[PDB]
């Protein structure tokens, strides 16, 4: 049970069954997924990215560690990923609004997480009422490393698909930031470096459209990535 793809080893762990690597994979997943979103939606120019291989069959641009502006974002995303180790991260999302600080989003790329108790088969309860993303992910079973690779490949191709064919062009002016939510288990003291505490998150207008990007199921974690937008079709 290992991922033997020669390209996969550069960005990702070869084994994702154990909790430490399961969590670290999730961290890397977040990095590559939001990299694809930021580049393919053209929120950031190509110069902020480095061309990479996810596998032998798929290439993807990822946030450049050698550029200051892009390194900041990557670090911030990595801080969020580290929260998956103890299970303190419910959701991390890129939120696009007309104006900075707006509650209501024009477009959202959301990744939502669920956690498993020791053994990686029993889903830990996640509530506000059952979290909307809990059920689909909880039903999921870890089907080995290559399924995880294929899941990652699906998500990347999906992000490319949505941006090229489905999503209408963004407005001339907008503001984009990252907004997250903690789990219930998360201590009050614990805080993800790079994110200021807030009692507000984001909201979507009632006629919002959606599209499933893909789901991830390593050994001891689960996640679902979705696109919420006013600019579909």
């Amino acid at each position: 049970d290992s991922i033997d793809d020669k390209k996969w080893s550069k960005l990702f762990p070869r084994i994702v069954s154990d909790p430490d690597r399961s969590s670290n994979f999730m961290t890397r997943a977040i990095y590559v997924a939001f990299s694809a979103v930021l580049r393919n939606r053209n929120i950031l120019g190509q110069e902020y990215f480095t061309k990479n291989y996810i596998t032998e069959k798929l290439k993807c641009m990822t946030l450049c560690f050698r550029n200051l502006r892009s390194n900041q974002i990557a670090q911030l995303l990595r801080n969020a990923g580290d929260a998956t180790k103890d299970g303190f991260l419910k959701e991390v999302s890129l939120v696009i609004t007309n104006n900075e600080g707006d509650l209501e989003a024009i477009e959202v790329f959301s990744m939502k997480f669920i956690y498993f108790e020791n053994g990686g088969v029993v889903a830990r309860l996640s509530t506000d009422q059952e979290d909307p993303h809990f059920a689909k992910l909880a039903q999921l079973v870890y089907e080995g490393g290559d399924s995880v690779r294929d899941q990652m490949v699906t998500i990347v191709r999906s992000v490319q698909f949505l941006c090229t064919k489905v999503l209408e062009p963004l407005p001339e002016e907008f503001t984009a930031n990252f907004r997250l939510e903690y789990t219930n288990d998360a201590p009050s003291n614990f805080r993800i470096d790079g994110f200021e505490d807030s009692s507000t998150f984001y909201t979507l207008p009632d006629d919002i459209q959606s599209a499933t990007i893909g789901h991830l199921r390593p050994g001891c974690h689960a996640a679902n990535m979705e696109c919420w937008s006013m600019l579909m079709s």
Binding site: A176, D197, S198
Partner: peptide, 13 residues
């Protein structure tokens, strides 16, 4: 209940 907002942001004008 509890949320976090990135100090970093991206602006288009």
């Amino acid at each position: 209940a509890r949320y976090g907002v990135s100090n970093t942001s991206i602006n288009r004008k």
